[PDB]
UniProtKB/Swiss-Prot annotation, chain A:
Domain PCI, residue spans: 13-159
Lineage: Eukaryota, Metazoa, Chordata, Craniata, Vertebrata
Species of the source: Homo sapiens (Human)
Subunit structure: Component of the 19S proteasome regulatory particle complex. The 26S proteasome consists of a 20S core particle (CP) and two 19S regulatory subunits (RP). The regulatory particle is made of a lid composed of 9 subunits including PSMD11, a base containing 6 ATPases and few additional components.
Reported tissue expression: Highly expressed in embryonic stem cells (ESCs). Expression decreases as ESCs differentiate.
Induction trigger: By FOXO4; expression in embryonic stem cells (ESCs) is mediated by FOXO4.
Family that this chain belongs to: Belongs to the proteasome subunit S9 family.
Post-translational modification: Phosphorylated by AMPK.
Residues that span the membrane, as ranges: none
Subcellular location as annotated: Nucleus; Cytoplasm, Cytosol
Location of cross-link Glycyl lysine isopeptide (Lys-Gly) (interchain with G-Cter in SUMO2): K63
Purpose of the protein: Component of the 26S proteasome, a multiprotein complex involved in the ATP-dependent degradation of ubiquitinated proteins. This complex plays a key role in the maintenance of protein homeostasis by removing misfolded or damaged proteins, which could impair cellular functions, and by removing proteins whose functions are no longer required. Therefore, the proteasome participates in numerous cellular processes, including cell cycle progression, apoptosis, or DNA damage repair. In the complex, PSMD11 is required for proteasome assembly.
Name assigned to this protein: 26S proteasome non-ATPase regulatory subunit 11
Swiss-Prot record, chain B:
Entry function: Component of the 26S proteasome, a multiprotein complex involved in the ATP-dependent degradation of ubiquitinated proteins. This complex plays a key role in the maintenance of protein homeostasis by removing misfolded or damaged proteins, which could impair cellular functions, and by removing proteins whose functions are no longer required. Therefore, the proteasome participates in numerous cellular processes, including cell cycle progression, apoptosis, or DNA damage repair.
Quaternary structure note: Component of the 19S proteasome regulatory particle complex. The 26S proteasome consists of a 20S core particle (CP) and two 19S regulatory subunits (RP). The regulatory particle is made of a lid composed of 9 subunits including PSMD7, a base containing 6 ATPases and few additional components. Within the complex, PSMD7 interacts with subunit PSMD4 through their respective MPN domain. Interacts with TRIM5.
Other remarks on this protein: Does not bind a metal ion.
Name of the protein in question: 26S proteasome non-ATPase regulatory subunit 7
Glycyl lysine isopeptide (Lys-Gly) (interchain with G-Cter in ubiquitin) cross-link site: K50
Parent-protein start and end of this portion: 131 to 195 of 324
Family stated for the protein in its record: Belongs to the peptidase M67A family.
Swiss-Prot record, chain C:
Modified residues (N6-acetyllysine): K204
PCI domain ranges (all copies): 77-244
Gene Ontology biological-process annotations: meiosis I; proteasome-mediated ubiquitin-dependent protein catabolic process; ubiquitin-dependent protein catabolic process
Functional description taken from the UniProt entry: Component of the 26S proteasome, a multiprotein complex involved in the ATP-dependent degradation of ubiquitinated proteins. This complex plays a key role in the maintenance of protein homeostasis by removing misfolded or damaged proteins, which could impair cellular functions, and by removing proteins whose functions are no longer required. Therefore, the proteasome participates in numerous cellular processes, including cell cycle progression, apoptosis, or DNA damage repair.
Subunit composition and interactions: Component of the 19S proteasome regulatory particle complex. The 26S proteasome consists of a 20S core particle (CP) and two 19S regulatory subunits (RP). The regulatory particle is made of a lid composed of 9 subunits including PSMD13, a base containing 6 ATPases and few additional components.
Organism lineage string: Eukaryota, Metazoa, Chordata, Craniata, Vertebrata
A GO term from the CC aspect: nucleus
Record carries keyword Acetylation: yes
Protein species of origin: Homo sapiens
Family from the record: Belongs to the proteasome subunit S11 family.
Record-given protein name: 26S proteasome non-ATPase regulatory subunit 13
From Swiss-Prot, chain D:
Subunit structure, interactors included: Component of the 19S proteasome regulatory particle complex. The 26S proteasome consists of a 20S core particle (CP) and two 19S regulatory subunits (RP). The regulatory particle is made of a lid composed of 9 subunits including PSMD12, a base containing 6 ATPases and few additional components. Interacts with ERCC6.
Keywords: Acetylation, Intellectual disability, Isopeptide bond, Proteasome, Ubl conjugation
Protein name: 26S proteasome non-ATPase regulatory subunit 12
Positions where N6-acetyllysine occurs in the chain: K129, K276
PCI domain boundaries: 150-328
Species: Homo sapiens (Human)
Keyword Translocase: no
Length: 159, 65, 282, 364
């Protein structure tokens, strides 16, 4: 587990850091249920950090993780569902509902801000997609966000 | 300046204007097909002219002239 | 009961079922067309065994279809098969007052139906056109008015609504029919340079408002009589393909002359070929 | 065991059949807890397991079932499918408990045990109602989430088995169910010939309404929604066919899901052929042909081109949207070269056709 903690504490190779928490959970399987259920959190946070949201629901629907149902595995399906539909407001309601286990852990409190920036631009290329020339005053009105910061954030995209 | 082998087909019609019993031939497309055994004999009996060596000018004469 | 006696006792080399089913349907003139008269025309449709011009039962099978399709049906199955009922004799050896009434019965069928868009070959059909020359001008004139494609000449025969049955029930789609034939003509009339008419010209040439001409052309594209595109902000349409019509000995003069200087254009460009690429191949 | 267990242990449960209706629940669940011990080693296990089924059914029926004892049948459901080769009575047992799973409100359990019997067909030839029970349990598994197209082959299969052909008014609500999914299904090639699989039918077109409904979606542009609801939003009570239309009306949350999805298919039916036949149309014009807000019109085209099922390039400054308008770098000359080969095939069509026409007038 902590081979994957410190290697993900610098955010260099998420794929190999994912592989530590996989083996950290396979050792915890059916012998230590307190340490096993927290191990699903670090593999699926990294998988959202890997930006493959559909594979989160693919794992927990598998019969190995169907035994380990709980609150925190529902806390990861919804955040993956928030990133699946690629929306900001979808992410906000998922935080407030499950806040006591999502925004409580010491590393999640470090990883949500970088996860927010990826998902900020992800809805931003979704709503800008269907058209041609358009105003900036509607895209601030369709994200429910300001204009000055969005104009800078749009300017980072073309740079 | 073409391929002097014609073939038709038989079609009949109880139709528009001519006769109660009407029947007129219709030309189906026609060409001379080849075969591996006969291309030995066909290309042997010519010995006259055969503008092969297809380069930049076989197309110029078989289909552009 | 006597028919099925004759149906079973005729076993000759002459086909029995072609005359007996037409004898069934001729006996079903009394009552009923949903079960037996239908199965006359539905069953016998393919038993014509390699004999075009079966003039004994060529007319009888087709006269049975004429009486059955003038009976409950659309208009137009009557209008199609009767061309082969009236397409088997040249000296009709019967009073022409019948044939001009039969053609007038056929003239009502090619008008009220929906799938009928010809008005050029039935018009140039030289056995029934002059047959009703001075009797009923108003039917022949409104045939011209469809090929004239105008809202105006159809209004001229609005004083002559002869044969008041089958008339006001279809009056909504008679007015739809003239607005649809109006676009075929001007697309054929305009040259292949542009053929790009506007909606205001349709509102001029069919006197119909702006909010319906888009519904008019989508019907024209769906039926398939025209193939083009539709703009909406520049208020124009790019018509490309139109339905081919018929023509007299005057439009071949245009097709003679537009073809004729296109002959020497094949001569002129190939003249460069055999003169510049001459030494490439003897 | 040699032809002596049959009259021995089945006679023990012949007694228990008489006491499950007579004796009180106290000694007989001691009878059951003393008879489920022998189930594993020596009991009904020769081939006659379908009398063991009614006594493991009898465990549920003493309390008349609840949520949890309905799930207590799971240990013996799939097992004796391997127990004895039999076509009907084994199926009658195993299609039961899924209705209990619906009372559990569990769909993932239901379709797994439904997966056993969809290959175990061809027992309908003796049963006039039991195959009909397999279908009536398989609506609600498909009715619930969004599956308006898994019910496709389902509803033709309750136009099936020849009980249905001779209950003319119950046959009418079979025609209701055979028509209210083809519209409601999301668009597919399978829907595009499902309209043909239901058409060409002699006895479907007896209803003059519903012949016109499928006529609307084979044909051209639809009258908008309000000029259709005044001509077809009233027949849903009339006739002798009200109950699947009441199944639209009755649960109003099922109605609101079926009002708006019927609205969804007809607001879309414009957008298919408006892309097909138009080149460039204004924003104000299209929102008027949908009879709703211009903002609500933009929300419709947003979630359809992120579906990329209809391509569009809309505008919100001049309101100028356009359909199927790419850059076309190479398709100009490419489609031009196609027009040559269509033309050169056409000049060859008439060329060998004229020379025979002279041969039938001036031959000899």
């Amino acid at each position: 587990m902590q081979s994957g903690i410190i290697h993900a504490a610098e955010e260099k190779d998420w794929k190999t850091a994912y592989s530590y928490f996989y083996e950290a959970f396979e050792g915890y399987d059916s012998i230590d249920s307190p340490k096993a259920i927290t191990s699903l959190k670090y593999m699926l946070l990294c998988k959202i950090m890997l930006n493959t949201p559909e594979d989160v629901q693919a794992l927990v629907s598998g019969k190995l993780a169907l035994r380990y149902a709980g609150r925190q595995t529902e806390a990861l399906k919804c955040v993956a569902q928030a990133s699946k539909n690629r929306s900001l407001a979808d992410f906000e309601k998922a935080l407030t509902d499950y806040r006591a286990e999502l925004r409580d852990d010491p590393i999640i409190s470090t990883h949500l801000a970088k996860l927010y920036d990826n998902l900020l631009e992800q809805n931003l290329i979704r709503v800008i997609e269907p058209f041609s020339r358009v105003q900036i005053e509607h895209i601030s009105s369709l994200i429910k966000l300001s204009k000055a910061d969005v104009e800078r954030k749009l300017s980072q995209m073309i740079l | 300046l073409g391929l002097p082998t014609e073939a038709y087909i038989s079609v009949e019609e109880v139709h528009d204007d001519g006769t109660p019993t009407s029947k007129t031939f219709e030309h189906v497309t026609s060409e001379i097909g080849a075969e591996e055994a006969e291309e030995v004999g066909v290309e042997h009996l010519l010995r006259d002219i055969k503008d092969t060596t297809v380069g930049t000018l076989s197309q110029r004469i078989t289909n552009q002239v | 009961t006597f028919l099925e006696k004759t149906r079973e006792k005729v076993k000759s080399s002459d086909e029995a079922v072609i005359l007996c089913k037409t004898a069934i349907g001729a006996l079903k003139l009394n009552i009923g067309d949903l079960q037996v008269t239908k199965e006359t025309i539905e069953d016998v449709e393919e038993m014509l065994n390699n004999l075009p011009g079966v003039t004994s039962v060529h007319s009888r099978f087709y006269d049975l279809s004429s009486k059955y399709y003038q009976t409950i049906g659309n208009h137009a199955s009557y209008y199609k098969d009767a061309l082969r009922f009236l397409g088997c004799v040249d000296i009709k050896d019967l009073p022409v007052s019948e044939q001009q009434e039969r053609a007038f019965t056929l003239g009502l069928a090619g008008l009220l139906g929906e799938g009928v868009f010809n008005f050029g070959e039935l018009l140039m059909h030289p056995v029934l056109e002059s047959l009703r020359n001075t009797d009923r001008q108003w039917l022949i004139d409104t045939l011209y008015a469809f090929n004239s494609g105008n809202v105006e000449r159809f209004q001229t025969l609005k004083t002559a609504w002869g044969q008041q049955p089958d008339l006001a029930a279809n009056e909504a789609q008679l007015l739809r029919k003239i607005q649809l034939l109006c676009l075929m003509e001007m697309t054929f009339t305009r040259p292949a340079n542009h053929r790009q008419l506007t909606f205001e010209e349709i509102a001029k040439s069919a006197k119909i408002t702006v909010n319906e001409v888009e519904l008019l052309v989508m019907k024209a594209l769906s039926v398939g009589l025209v193939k083009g595109s539709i703009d909406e902000v520049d208020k124009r349409v790019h018509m490309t393909w139109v339905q081919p019509r018929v023509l007299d000995l005057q439009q071949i003069k245009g097709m003679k002359d537009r073809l004729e200087f296109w002959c020497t254009d094949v001569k002129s460009m190939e003249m460069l070929v055999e003169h510049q690429a001459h030494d490439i191949l003897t | 065991r040699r032809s002596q267990l049959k009259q021995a242990v089945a006679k023990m449960v012949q007694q228990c059949c008489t006491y499950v209706e007579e004796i009180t629940d106290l000694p007989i669940k001691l009878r059951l807890i003393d008879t489920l011990r022998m189930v594993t080693e020596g009991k009904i296990y020769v081939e006659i397991e379908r009398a063991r089924l009614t006594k493991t059914l009898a465990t549920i029926k003493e309390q008349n079932g609840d949520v949890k004892e309905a799930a207590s049948i799971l240990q013996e459901l799939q097992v004796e499918t391997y127990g004895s080769m039999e076509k009907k009575e084994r199926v009658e047992f195993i299609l039961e408990q899924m209705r209990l799973c619906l009372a559990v409100k569990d769909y993932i359990r239901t379709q797994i045990i439904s997966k056993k019997i969809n290959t175990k067909f061809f027992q309908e030839e003796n049963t006039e109602k039991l195959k009909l029970k397999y279908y009536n349990l398989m609506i609600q598994l498909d009715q619930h989430e969004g599956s308006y197209l898994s019910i496709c082959k389902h509803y033709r299969a309750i136009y099936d088995t020849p009980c249905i052909q001779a209950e003319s008014e119950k046959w009418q609500q079979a025609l209701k169910s055979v028509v209210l999914y083809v519209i409601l299904a999301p668009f597919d090639n399978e829907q595009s010939d499902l309209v043909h699989r239901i058409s060409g039918d002699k006895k479907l077109e007896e209803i003059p309404k519903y012949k016109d409904l499928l006529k609307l979606f084979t044909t051209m542009e639809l009258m908008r929604w309000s000029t259709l609801v005044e001509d077809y939003g009233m027949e849903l009570r009339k006739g002798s066919l009200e109950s699947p239309a009441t199944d639209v009306f009755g649960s109003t949350e099922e109605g609101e899901k079926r009002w708006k999805d019927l609205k969804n298919r007809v607001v879309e039916h414009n957008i298919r052929i408006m892309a097909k036949y138009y080149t460039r149309i204004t924003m104000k014009r299209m929102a008027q042909l949908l009879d709703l807000s211009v903002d609500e019109s933009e929300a419709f085209l947003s979630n359809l081109v992120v579906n990329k099922t209809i391509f569009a390039k809309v505008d919100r400054l001049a309101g100028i949207i356009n359909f199927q308008r790419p850059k076309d770098p190479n398709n100009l000359l490419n489609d031009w070269s196609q027009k040559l080969n269509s033309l050169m095939s056409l000049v060859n069509k008439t060329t060998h056709l004229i020379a025979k026409e002279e041969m039938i007038h001036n031959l000899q």
